[PDB]
Nucleic acid binder design. Structure first.
Lengths: 112, 104, 107, 98
DNA sequence: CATAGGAAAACTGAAAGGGAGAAGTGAAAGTG
DNA sequence: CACTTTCACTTCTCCCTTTCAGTTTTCCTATG
């Protein structure tokens, strides 16, 4: 099925409802707020799949093909943040990215 | 009954005021505005009504086609001596419209 | 009706009235266009020279009727060249610190 | 929002920051005092950008020094010409516009 | 212990930059 | 006539990405 580029919010809601990425989850019964893992790239404990969502999105649009392009976790993170930053209907609700243990951010759908 | 002519039909729809944003724009009623929102806009007239008046569109029978309604309306108006396009505000993000004037 | 952008361009290159808008070969088929990034702290009106000249040619921009919108000028100049048979972008140096420009060729 | 280098030439030409000076004639070389403060042009910068508002914020002179050294670090056409931050007497560093 | 200092590189918001491609246009052929 | 469609273009909206110009974090060693 000749897919059009998915749009970031519809796509991401998928990822939330389906729960297949570790630490990317709805955080409440009403499915209104959600968490995103958000570890800093200079951290020594950091890997690839630390930040799956950023990579996942770079791949959902065709921007990064594993093995064709050089991996660039900084660029993925910044594209994702950037895309969501433009979205009426969405806000950054809680920045816990400097946490030494479960660094993440919480976002919240806001009804128009 | 026969086909309406665009100019008297147009005048009649401006008079009746049943179409939102379609209105005389001065006191002497020789200038007027037509809503002119660009079709690629999510939030997306008289264009349709003229398609309905002329038999070019029947709801049910036809697939809607705002682009062709707008194009036909515009080209029909371009031809008319005695009517000029006075102002193009079709890009404005709040009330995209154009302003015509009956002249002679 | 709107001018076509490619004949207007040759005309503009020949007149040679815009800084860094030039033929860069003898046969006049290769030309350069300045392309500095708007966000650069040394940017102004004539950093968008052919872009404005083009918005004025098509009547989009009337200095005094309209407010400058250089991203839109640049947007529409680039869009008008965007997939044009007969022109290709030979070289993107819009990123150069020194003289950001792009090189285009007639094909 | 002020740009660091135009801003810095403007602090140097104005000469009203203790120990921050043109050290040259062609005005292309300059000093900035660099004491290991462990018991100001760095705060000047932090206030100029809104990073620090005295009263709203906890004073943080190491961060201010950090942000200021890191900004200058990124500018092409500025060079650290002499590091005398480890001189016992007048701890300072010398930069040079190139 | 404690904090301050460094360079390198990751990070950030705001705004410019980009591309795809549907829809926009006037002039003039076409339609009955 | 009296519009409607075709042709040969340009440009606009959607919907993100990337640059700009610093700013922070990391992971350390030095200093107090």
């Amino acid at each position: 099925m000749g897919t059009p580029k998915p749009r970031i919010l519809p796509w991401l809601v998928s990822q939330l409802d389906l729960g297949q990425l570790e630490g990317v989850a709805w955080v409440n019964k009403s499915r209104t707020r959600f968490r995103i893992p958000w570890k800093h790239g200079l951290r020594q404990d950091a890997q690839q799949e630390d930040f799956g969502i950023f990579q996942a999105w770079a791949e959902a649009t065709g921007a990064y093909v594993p093995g064709r392009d050089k991996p660039d976790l900084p660029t993925w993170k910044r594209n994702f943040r950037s895309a969501l930053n433009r979205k009426e209907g969405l806000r950054l609700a809680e920045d816990r990215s400097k946490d030494p243990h479960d660094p993440h951010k919480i976002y919240e759908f806001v009804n128009s």
